[PDB]
Ligand binder design. Sequence first.
Ligand SMILES: [Cu+2]
Ligand SMILES: [Cu+2]
Ligand SMILES: [Zn+2]
Ligand SMILES: [Zn+2]
Lengths: 151, 151
Amino acid sequence: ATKAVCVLKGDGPVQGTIHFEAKGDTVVVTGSITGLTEGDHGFHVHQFGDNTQGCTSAGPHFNPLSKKHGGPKDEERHVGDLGNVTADKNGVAIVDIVDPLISLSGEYSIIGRTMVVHEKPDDLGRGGNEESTKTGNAGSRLACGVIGIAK
Amino acid sequence: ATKAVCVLKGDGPVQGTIHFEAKGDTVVVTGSITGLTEGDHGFHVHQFGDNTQGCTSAGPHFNPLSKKHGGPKDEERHVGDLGNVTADKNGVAIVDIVDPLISLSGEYSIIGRTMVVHEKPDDLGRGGNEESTKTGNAGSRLACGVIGIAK
Ligand SMILES: [Cu+2]
Ligand SMILES: [Cu+2]
Ligand SMILES: [Zn+2]
Ligand SMILES: [Zn+2]
């Protein structure tokens, strides 16, 4: 596909729409998320597009290269590690990311997988406990959605 | 992808979980839908995995081969025409379909697209009218979901 979309929903007030578009050899991620607490929130692609148990059945971070968690700019990162989105005073976060690891086709395709917005900030694999190395201490999954092909 | 899952949701009471498994050159579709009126309901793969406007933004039946609407056993059918599912007196439909056109990979892949359960029976292209050859006269979209990768 050259375009994908994801509608995020959860059990609280957090909702949003994220669009993905292949522009050249990279993927541009845009959109906005509302209902969040002010500050940074971990924003990642989880492996399974399985919503049978809410966001929980999405599994861990998409990680075909079997690396540890990190920031979007690190070499050692999961493919699904997109960093943090930042909510303003009003709970609105605007998404504007360009990423070199995800794709809309092939082995790194994220179509069919789940976008998750987390409760806390992602520490980028630098928190110093085992958990940092897995999820960045980003905490619970506030909203998520399966990434589908768009028009 | 060898397994997929879809969780169907809408604005009324219809809900369900559909599972997909690649077996030889076919896809085996299983699962259950509840909250349906007794009888037949059309069950099709729609083109886009776009839920921004409910089931409406899913677009038309998935039809990469530009054919007219038919039943699953017809040569002239859309790739997304899986026929009808049947709800019992209690409103429960058990899904058990084996289909050779839909796929979980390649060009006819349905991952990232939308599974839709309709209000009325699909006439399989034999309704005599023009709508019959587009949608089977299945009526409105009761519940739908994006097809994601499962474990
Ligand atoms: Cu995460
Ligand atoms: Cu349909
Ligand atoms: Zn990660
Ligand atoms: Zn059709």
